[PDB]
Design a protein around this ligand. Structure first.
Ligand code: 8BM
Length: 283
């Protein structure tokens, strides 16, 4: 459930990162009356031109707090003062992109494929909750332990209505190199455009943190996609793995895999990792 916190109960220790959304801190939560110190991440939101009423914020928080899955970062509490502060699970090892770049020489097929499974399970849960993420990338996956990762949201995720199949976005900055063509051209987002971004995220992992379409201007991306160019097969990937990824980047959104299928296929592979990824000195 949603805990409402007073300023007396938690403390920001240090900045972990920032962005348009605001700032995230490593923090400590000491709930009143209880006798425990809980390491947390505190996300303090940037002030908006038109701040929501507290009731609006609380309503969104309740829904957010109900997102309960092993592979999505949970909201534990909220403090509403002059700023909105969201108290969330701390992921001690940071984001997955930096983690795979810094530990590449010690990451094997088992870890990579398990991560693919976990991310797919978290995205499937989001889809079941009717949430379109809209910002899936290795940077937005966080590391609880080397064996356990969780997706999080920095503001772009959207709840779809019971009868809506798509989110139609407005203006602003978009992570072009992670987006499905239909999102780039028309600002349309669905669970299936999340699948496209999932594929790019997997490619990031399999290349140990290479930048997608390196050196290619974001403005030229939709053009090369229309020509049928995609991200290249990572050298460690077998054709079977690369084909799943390529399938995530079909032009036809409904020809892309569903996350439930991605869970199944990557679970099969994670069960015999060295068959599907070939990494020197893996064992
Ligand atoms: C804007 C954006 O995409 N980001 C991604 C990370 C950051 N947001 C974040 N970071 C969390 N934890 C964390 C972060 C860096 C470290 N390293 C330890 C190793 N050093 C060499 C460098 C510091 C360690 C832990 C974190 N934990 C939970 N959350 C969410 C749920 C609010 C986090 N967000 C800002």
């Amino acid at each position: 459930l949603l805990r409402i916190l007073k300023e007396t109960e938690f403390k920001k220790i240090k900045v972990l990162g920032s962005g348009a959304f605001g700032t995230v801190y490593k923090g400590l939560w000491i709930p009143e009356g209880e006798k425990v110190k809980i390491p947390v991440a505190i996300k303090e939101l940037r002030e908006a031109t038109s701040p929501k009423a507290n009731k609006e914020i609380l309503d969104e928080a309740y829904v957010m707090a109900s997102v309960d899955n092993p592979h999505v970062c949970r909201l534990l509490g909220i403090c509403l003062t002059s700023t909105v502060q969201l108290i969330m699970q701390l992921m001690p090892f940071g984001c997955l992109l930096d983690y795979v770049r810094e530990h590449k020489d010690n990451i094997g097929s088992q870890y990579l494929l398990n991560w693919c499974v976990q991310i797919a399970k978290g995205m499937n849960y989001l889809e079941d909750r009717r949430l379109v993420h809209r910002d899936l990338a290795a940077r937005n996956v966080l590391v609880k332990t080397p064996q356990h990762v969780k997706i999080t949201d920095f503001g772009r995720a959207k709840l779809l209505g019971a009868e809506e199949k798509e989110y139609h976005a407005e203006g602003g900055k978009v992570p072009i190199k992670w987006m499905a063509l239909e999102s780039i051209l028309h600002r349309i987002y669905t669970h299936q455009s999340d699948v496209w971004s999932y594929g790019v995220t997997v490619w990031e992992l399999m290349t140990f943190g290479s930048k997608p379409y390196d050196g290619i201007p974001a403005s030229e991306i939709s053009s090369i996609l229309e020509k049928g160019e995609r991200l290249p097969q990572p050298p460690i990937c077998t054709i079977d793995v690369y084909m799943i990824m390529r399938k995530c980047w079909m032009i036809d959104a409904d020809s892309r895999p569903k996350f439930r299928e991605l869970i199944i296929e990557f679970s099969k592979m994670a069960r015999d990792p060295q068959r599907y990824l070939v990494i020197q000195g893996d064992e």
